[PDB]
Design an enzyme around this catalytic site. Structure first.
Site, mmCIF file in Angstrom:
data_model
loop_
_atom_site.group_PDB
_atom_site.id
_atom_site.type_symbol
_atom_site.label_atom_id
_atom_site.label_comp_id
_atom_site.label_asym_id
_atom_site.label_seq_id
_atom_site.Cartn_x
_atom_site.Cartn_y
_atom_site.Cartn_z
ATOM 1 N N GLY A 58 0.808 -1.209 0.000
ATOM 2 C CA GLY A 58 0.000 0.000 0.000
ATOM 3 C C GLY A 58 0.845 1.264 0.000
ATOM 4 O O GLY A 58 2.062 1.193 0.071
ATOM 5 N N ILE A 59 0.194 2.418 -0.090
ATOM 6 C CA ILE A 59 0.904 3.674 -0.266
ATOM 7 C C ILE A 59 1.716 4.010 0.995
ATOM 8 O O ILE A 59 2.775 4.615 0.903
ATOM 9 C CB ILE A 59 -0.073 4.821 -0.653
ATOM 10 C CG1 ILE A 59 0.689 6.045 -1.177
ATOM 11 C CG2 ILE A 59 -1.010 5.200 0.500
ATOM 12 C CD1 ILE A 59 -0.220 7.015 -1.949
ATOM 13 N N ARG A 116 -2.150 -9.954 -3.261
ATOM 14 C CA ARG A 116 -1.534 -10.208 -4.556
ATOM 15 C C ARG A 116 -0.107 -10.723 -4.448
ATOM 16 O O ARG A 116 0.562 -10.517 -3.440
ATOM 17 C CB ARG A 116 -1.563 -8.936 -5.403
ATOM 18 C CG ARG A 116 -2.887 -8.695 -6.072
ATOM 19 C CD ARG A 116 -2.915 -7.304 -6.687
ATOM 20 N NE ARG A 116 -3.190 -6.282 -5.683
ATOM 21 C CZ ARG A 116 -3.508 -5.026 -5.974
ATOM 22 N NH1 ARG A 116 -3.591 -4.639 -7.241
ATOM 23 N NH2 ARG A 116 -3.748 -4.162 -5.000
ATOM 24 N N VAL A 160 -6.927 -10.847 4.834
ATOM 25 C CA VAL A 160 -7.296 -10.667 6.233
ATOM 26 C C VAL A 160 -8.808 -10.555 6.434
ATOM 27 O O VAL A 160 -9.277 -10.444 7.562
ATOM 28 C CB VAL A 160 -6.592 -9.437 6.872
ATOM 29 C CG1 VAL A 160 -5.063 -9.644 6.884
ATOM 30 C CG2 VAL A 160 -6.963 -8.173 6.139
ATOM 31 N N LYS A 220 -11.349 11.460 6.919
ATOM 32 C CA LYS A 220 -12.782 11.133 6.880
ATOM 33 C C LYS A 220 -13.383 10.896 8.268
ATOM 34 O O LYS A 220 -14.595 10.889 8.422
ATOM 35 C CB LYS A 220 -13.096 9.963 5.938
ATOM 36 C CG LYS A 220 -13.049 10.355 4.456
ATOM 37 C CD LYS A 220 -13.564 9.242 3.526
ATOM 38 C CE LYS A 220 -13.111 7.864 3.991
ATOM 39 N NZ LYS A 220 -12.221 7.130 3.066
ATOM 40 N N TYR A 228 -14.305 4.000 10.196
ATOM 41 C CA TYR A 228 -13.223 4.364 11.112
ATOM 42 C C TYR A 228 -13.653 4.205 12.580
ATOM 43 O O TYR A 228 -12.870 3.747 13.402
ATOM 44 C CB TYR A 228 -12.744 5.809 10.883
ATOM 45 C CG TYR A 228 -12.008 6.050 9.571
ATOM 46 C CD1 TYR A 228 -11.537 4.994 8.796
ATOM 47 C CD2 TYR A 228 -11.774 7.342 9.120
ATOM 48 C CE1 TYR A 228 -10.835 5.231 7.588
ATOM 49 C CE2 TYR A 228 -11.090 7.584 7.933
ATOM 50 C CZ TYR A 228 -10.620 6.527 7.173
ATOM 51 O OH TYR A 228 -9.949 6.807 5.994
ATOM 52 N N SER A 273 -2.196 1.213 -4.921
ATOM 53 C CA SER A 273 -3.049 1.947 -3.996
ATOM 54 C C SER A 273 -4.412 2.316 -4.588
ATOM 55 O O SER A 273 -4.511 2.670 -5.764
ATOM 56 C CB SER A 273 -2.333 3.213 -3.523
ATOM 57 O OG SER A 273 -3.143 3.918 -2.606
HETATM 58 N N1 LIG Z 1 -4.334 6.598 0.176
HETATM 59 C C1 LIG Z 1 -4.744 7.862 0.689
HETATM 60 O O1 LIG Z 1 -4.579 8.887 0.033
HETATM 61 C C2 LIG Z 1 -5.409 7.930 2.083
HETATM 62 C C3 LIG Z 1 -5.652 9.158 2.631
HETATM 63 C C4 LIG Z 1 -6.243 9.243 3.866
HETATM 64 C C5 LIG Z 1 -6.578 8.078 4.539
HETATM 65 N N2 LIG Z 1 -6.343 6.836 3.994
HETATM 66 C C6 LIG Z 1 -6.730 5.653 4.733
HETATM 67 O O2 LIG Z 1 -5.454 4.742 5.019
HETATM 68 C C7 LIG Z 1 -5.929 3.563 5.369
HETATM 69 C C8 LIG Z 1 -5.124 2.480 4.584
HETATM 70 O O3 LIG Z 1 -5.366 2.752 3.227
HETATM 71 P P1 LIG Z 1 -4.184 2.973 2.163
HETATM 72 O O4 LIG Z 1 -4.508 4.146 1.296
HETATM 73 O O5 LIG Z 1 -2.837 3.068 2.831
HETATM 74 O O6 LIG Z 1 -4.298 1.620 1.351
HETATM 75 P P2 LIG Z 1 -3.689 1.199 -0.054
HETATM 76 O O7 LIG Z 1 -2.636 2.193 -0.507
HETATM 77 O O8 LIG Z 1 -4.838 1.021 -1.019
HETATM 78 O O9 LIG Z 1 -2.998 -0.241 0.211
HETATM 79 C C9 LIG Z 1 -3.842 -1.330 0.660
HETATM 80 C C10 LIG Z 1 -2.936 -2.497 1.074
HETATM 81 O O10 LIG Z 1 -3.617 -3.414 1.715
HETATM 82 C C11 LIG Z 1 -3.691 -4.719 0.790
HETATM 83 N N3 LIG Z 1 -4.989 -5.258 0.965
HETATM 84 C C12 LIG Z 1 -6.217 -4.836 0.573
HETATM 85 N N4 LIG Z 1 -7.141 -5.724 1.013
HETATM 86 C C13 LIG Z 1 -6.486 -6.696 1.687
HETATM 87 C C14 LIG Z 1 -6.960 -7.842 2.305
HETATM 88 N N5 LIG Z 1 -8.308 -8.327 2.443
HETATM 89 N N6 LIG Z 1 -6.106 -8.693 2.918
HETATM 90 C C15 LIG Z 1 -4.754 -8.421 2.907
HETATM 91 N N7 LIG Z 1 -4.288 -7.288 2.280
HETATM 92 C C16 LIG Z 1 -5.159 -6.419 1.665
HETATM 93 C C17 LIG Z 1 -3.451 -4.250 -0.426
HETATM 94 O O11 LIG Z 1 -2.846 -5.232 -1.374
HETATM 95 P P3 LIG Z 1 -3.724 -6.315 -2.108
HETATM 96 O O12 LIG Z 1 -4.828 -5.679 -2.903
HETATM 97 O O13 LIG Z 1 -2.800 -7.075 -3.032
HETATM 98 O O14 LIG Z 1 -4.294 -7.215 -1.054
HETATM 99 C C18 LIG Z 1 -2.397 -3.146 -0.200
HETATM 100 O O15 LIG Z 1 -1.151 -3.641 0.038
HETATM 101 C C19 LIG Z 1 -7.405 3.557 4.959
HETATM 102 O O16 LIG Z 1 -8.278 3.683 6.020
HETATM 103 C C20 LIG Z 1 -7.480 4.821 4.074
HETATM 104 O O17 LIG Z 1 -8.915 5.246 3.934
HETATM 105 C C21 LIG Z 1 -5.744 6.755 2.768
HETATM 106 CL CL LIG Z 2 -9.712 9.411 4.985
#
Ligand SMILES: NC(=O)c1ccc[n+]([C@@H]2O[C@H](COP(=O)([O-])OP(=O)(O)OC[C@H]3O[C@@H](n4cnc5c(N)ncnc54)[C@H](OP(=O)(O)O)[C@@H]3O)[C@@H](O)[C@H]2O)c1
Ligand SMILES: [Cl-]
Ligand SMILES: NC(=O)c1ccc[n+]([C@@H]2O[C@H](COP(=O)([O-])OP(=O)(O)OC[C@H]3O[C@@H](n4cnc5c(N)ncnc54)[C@H](OP(=O)(O)O)[C@@H]3O)[C@@H](O)[C@H]2O)c1
Ligand SMILES: [Cl-]
EC number: 1.3.1.3
Lengths: 364, 364
Positions: A12-13, A40, A58, A123, A154, A188
């Protein structure tokens, strides 16, 4: 090893930042051993980090028991994942259960577990994107603002975290609420820098102008962002410093920017001389990038790019959310008061992450 | 004594902070000996500081030679004063000459002089208040933004600073550009907290609502402020730090606020239950406080206040300038990148300075 990390969402990011930063020799709490989880197969751009990569879904309680419970030496969990469902009640169920599954798989089996970091976001203060006319807080958001009386996964997750951690004596938690994230992860689901890089690369290839897809109010308004490395740094800080225990923290770069300003920087990074805002041309990237699959294919073949599928790295819907709003800014006062003084210059952060999408051959 | 300070404007809103902070045992560059200069006899609210208070009019070259040239042990100058004239060209002559007189009185006669701090402000980026239609920079302001091609006594002063200090190879300089200052000095020519305190005190005494005097855009907009103690801290940092030499720095609290938010806090600190924004009632404090001398006199007698003259502490014109703008914010990235990580939570800053005006019996 001094500490042993379990990263849920390691591609992820933020997960990808944690995977690279945790094993470094100067990282606090180190030397670190790292487990990284995602569904993946490990992508090549994640592959150099010295971690143990574990394929695990998970959302599957059996799978988490089978793949996570054996990790008995884990000391710190970094939860940095979500699933995007079509209703918020489904978001609550699915994302609550993902977190619950992880906690219930590791807590009874990792006797040296000390801390869990939970990443959520801004959010918290706004509600889900669909919360258009309901209640919301007034920026700048602070961590002691009360929960909105509207459904939000959340809150569901926080409650689960609190309840599971209360059951044990030896574990603390921290919650981290970033704003829009600047970082590197083609995988991401929400990726403003990666998506703008794809858009800019296309305009450069076409020789067409870099036109702002979003609203005049987002063009002129103030925003902030959260550098993915900075987020990782704050989670590591909370994970190793007892002063931060059992608290929620915002985490953004601590400066302010306007999209008008970063737009010029974007154009300059891609060598696009014609850029700007033009009302009527700002139709959102979902619409503006419709039918670009052929030219993307041309760009990939011409430039030896590594992701052939446009919709994988061109995540238009989220860019269109970001570039439709203004002033959704969060306060970094509590972080500073607690002694976390990490920051980023957002101009330089933006430029640095742009460079990564080029270096990993996602865009020319 | 490790260092010897000369504060020009020691009863001013930053001067008073410097005077209190420099002599503290833990202050960098300490232990400090401190000289403080102003025209008026030392006011009681300035009296606590362990400084050598010197009456001197720095617009008078003869006076500066007579009173400053004998201060041969001075190591650091902190220049924190100005004179408000009716045209910018006169502002340039008068303020340029004040700075020049100080420099020319001290540089030849203080063999251990090491550094000069010059305080200017955000008007560096905006021009004088009268510059309503001429060119202006786009916020957030950064120190490397080029000078506007419009007359500005800050530019005049910098040029004089550079020219005088160029003649002596053992002296460095630093420039500090605060935004609206939160601080304590009844004498200050521009004093948003002191003046709002007087306004709130009057509303409270009258039993009338705390109505916002300024524009809707200012009510809803983002702003930042500069805590006077924080400004003093930055000047001290620049005075001793090897990385800060010969540079200009912004200096604000590093967070953002809305007047809508601070207004509730103001109401609460003065125990006023009726407060807010009402269109058509926002006529500016100059107009709204016309003819309030009577009620002020009553308040002064009833609560034994230490400043009897309403317009000495009710500086309406400046408050009206402030409460008619928004978004005029400066970046703190350079400061942070240079190692100055000082900050204030503006809510807590606002509250702390409000208490000072109460503690020194300026308002009830
Ligand atoms: N990205 C933003 O700009 C941003 C901003 C504010 C808040 N947030 C929040 O940060 C939190 C984490 O999000 P993120 O943006 O960091 O996520 P992300 O960049 O989309 O990465 C998600 C990670 O989790 C894996 N994943 C998804 N579903 C899974 C599952 N069932 N089991 C195991 N691994 C799984 C994904 O890989 P696979 O698909 O291969 O499983 C990936 O490695 C969230 O609550 C998000 O709303 C994000
Ligand atoms: Cl958010
Ligand atoms: N206050 C703000 O909100 C603010 C914000 C941004 C920038 N700035 C800038 O900060 C710089 C310093 O202003 P300030 O606001 O800190 O000043 P201030 O609060 O008004 O204090 C002025 C000080 O200098 C003294 N003084 C005035 N004329 C003098 C003279 N000829 N000789 C000796 N002493 C004299 C004053 O006392 P006496 O009258 O008794 O001499 C007083 O001690 C200015 O460039 C200002 O534009 C101020
Ligand atoms: Cl100014």
């Amino acid at each position: 090893f001094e500490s042993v990390a379990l990263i849920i969402g390691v591609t992820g990011i933020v997960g990808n930042s944690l995977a690279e930063i945790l094993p470094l020799s100067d990282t606090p709490g180190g030397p670190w051993k790292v487990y990284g989880v995602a569904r993946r197969p490990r992508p090549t751009w994640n592959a150099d980090h010295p971690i143990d990569y574990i394929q695990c879904d998970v959302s599957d309680a059996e799978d988490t028991r089978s793949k996570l419970s054996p990790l008995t030496d884990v000391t710190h969990v970094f939860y940095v994942t979500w699933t995007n469902r079509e209703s918020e009640s489904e978001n609550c169920e699915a994302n609550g259960s993902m977190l619950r599954n992880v906690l219930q798989a590791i807590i009874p089996y990792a006797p040296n577990l000390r801390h869990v970091c939970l990443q959520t976001g801004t959010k918290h203060y706004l509600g889900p994107f669909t919360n258009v006319d309901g209640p919301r807080h007034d920026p700048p958001f602070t961590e002691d603002m009360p929960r909105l009386q509207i459904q939000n996964f959340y809150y569901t997750q926080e409650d689960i975290l609190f309840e599971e951690i209360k059951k044990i004596e030896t574990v603390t938690w921290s919650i981290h609420r970033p704003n829009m994230i600047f970082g590197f992860s083609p995988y991401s689901l929400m990726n403003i820098v990666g998506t703008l890089c794809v858009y800019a690369a296309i305009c450069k290839h076409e020789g067409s102008p870099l036109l702002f897809p979003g609203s005049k109010k987002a063009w002129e308004g103030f925003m902030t962002a959260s550098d993915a490395d900075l987020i990782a740094e704050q989670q590591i800080w909370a994970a190793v410093d007892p002063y931060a225990k059992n608290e929620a923290f915002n985490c953004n770069n601590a400066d302010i920017f306007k999209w008008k300003h970063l737009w010029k920087i974007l154009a300059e990074q891609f060598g696009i001389e014609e850029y700007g805002f033009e009302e009527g041309k700002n139709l959102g990237l979902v619409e503006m990038m419709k039918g670009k699959e052929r030219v993307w294919e041309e760009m990939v073949k011409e430039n030896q790019l590594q992701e052939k599928k446009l919709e994988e790295v061109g995540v238009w819907w989220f860019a269109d959310v970001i570039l439709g709003v203004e002033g959704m800014i969060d306060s970094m006062n509590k972080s500073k008061e607690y002694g976390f003084l990490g920051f980023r210059n957002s101009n330089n952060s933006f430029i640095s992450w742009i460079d990564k999408y080029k270096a990993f051959k996602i865009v020319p």
